[PDB]
Amino acid sequence: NSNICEVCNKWGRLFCCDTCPRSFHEHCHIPSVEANKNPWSCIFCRIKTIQERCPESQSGHQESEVLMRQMLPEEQLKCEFLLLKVYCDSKSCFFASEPYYNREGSQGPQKPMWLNKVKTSLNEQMYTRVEGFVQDMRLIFHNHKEFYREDKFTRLGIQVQDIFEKNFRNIFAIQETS
Numbered sequence: 001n002s003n004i005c006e007v008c009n010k011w012g013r014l015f016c017c018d019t020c021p022r023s024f025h026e027h028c029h030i031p032s033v034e035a036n037k038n039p040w041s042c043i044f045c046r047i048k049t050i051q052e053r054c055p056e057s058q059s060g061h062q063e064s065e066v067l068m069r070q071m072l073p074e075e076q077l078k079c080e081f082l083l084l085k086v087y088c089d090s091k092s093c094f095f096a097s098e099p100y101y102n103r104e105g106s107q108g109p110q111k112p113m114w115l116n117k118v119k120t121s122l123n124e125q126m127y128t129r130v131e132g133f134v135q136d137m138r139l140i141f142h143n144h145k146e147f148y149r150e151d152k153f154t155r156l157g158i159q160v161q162d163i164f165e166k167n168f169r170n171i172f173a174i175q176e177t178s
């Protein structure tokens with residue numbers, strides 16, 4: 001197995017996947033690495049298994065249909081994985097914890113949002129449809145773009161949104177378009 005966490009790229013107290021060479025800190029993995037369970041399979045392995053069991057699940061889909069899906073176990077897992085893929089980018093640090101807004105010439109958002117809040121919301125089964133999760137994720141970046149206006153720091157929101165969107169299209173097998 002790897003000797004660094006797949007998500008944050010640091011060593012420490014790591015839990016090793018039994019079915020691939022990846023390793024994780026406890027709370028870097030999503031869901032948090034399960035207490036017992038030998039063997040243990042990581043979220044990358046669990047997603048791969050879904051795909052292998054239903055090869056047709058990789059045919060293209062319409063985003064509108066994906067968003068209306070109820071958060072049954074497989075959709076719950078796909079959203080957990082998509083959230084984890086965002087945390088895998090180091091630029092996710094800017095969006096992880098609760099933000100505050102005090103900048104001359106800007107007003108903070110009506111509905112603040114951040115990655116750890118989405119993480120808790122998933123853990124607590126607060127989303128009933130995929131749409132709920134995707135709306136909160138997109139809100140994170142939209143709030144950032146709006147608040148930072150013309151400051152070049154706005155680009156961090158663009159960059160992390162692009163990682164989110166690319167992974168959304170891959171995980172949920174959204175039909176390719178120009």
Ligand SMILES: [Zn+2]
Pocket residue numbers: 005006007008009010024025028
């Ligand atoms: Zn980690």
Ligand SMILES: [Zn+2]
Pocket residue numbers: 017018019020021022041042043044045
């Ligand atoms: Zn694995």
Ligand SMILES: [Zn+2]
Pocket residue numbers: 053054055
């Ligand atoms: Zn089948």
